[PDB]
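Researcher: Can you fold this with 5VA in place?
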Amino acid sequence: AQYEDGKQYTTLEKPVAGAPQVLEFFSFFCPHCYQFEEVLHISDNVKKKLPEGVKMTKYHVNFMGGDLGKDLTQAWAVAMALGVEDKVTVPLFEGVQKTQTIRSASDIRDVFINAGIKGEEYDAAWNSFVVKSLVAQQEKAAADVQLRGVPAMFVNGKYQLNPQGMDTSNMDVFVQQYADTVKYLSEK
Ligand SMILES: CNCc1cccc(-c2ccsc2)c1
């Protein structure tokens, strides 16, 4: 009774078939997601503790930030397609929430250019159907679980992380609790 359904995690009443093993959702507009990623480094510490053969997937969502939110989901598709997530995640979060210099799709593009992604490369990707397919994949995944809040993490389409059942007096402890819970669920 150390881990229990309803505490560190909840159980999906409609389990999602064929879902990624560990699926994280976020928005660059999401203040708690900024904390999760830039301050707590949740994705990294979770990934760091996944069993061998367990892949981690991270998807952007549309339902925050209106038009720009949709642009960001497309830009994240570009980031995934090019494999430059580790290059643009920080400046995208800071551009939206710290400096608030990201106000348009062009501003988003500037972040990729500054990170060394060539203009032609970004634009071809941005306009590609491979990227359209990746946008659709992100939307479908979020749709599969009736997603309406971020940050969120799901394990095997069956369990949903519940950070509200964790102590926050110490950041590092919270993070390891979160990561050990994901590991526990992935072995479940
Ligand atoms: C959805 N936000 C979850 C959460 C739960 C507990 C602590 C935090 C936190 C602690 C320092 S920054 C953000 C976030």
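Model: Folded with 5VA in place. The helical segments are 31-39, 42-47, 66-82, 85-98, 105-114, 119-126, 129-144, 171-186.
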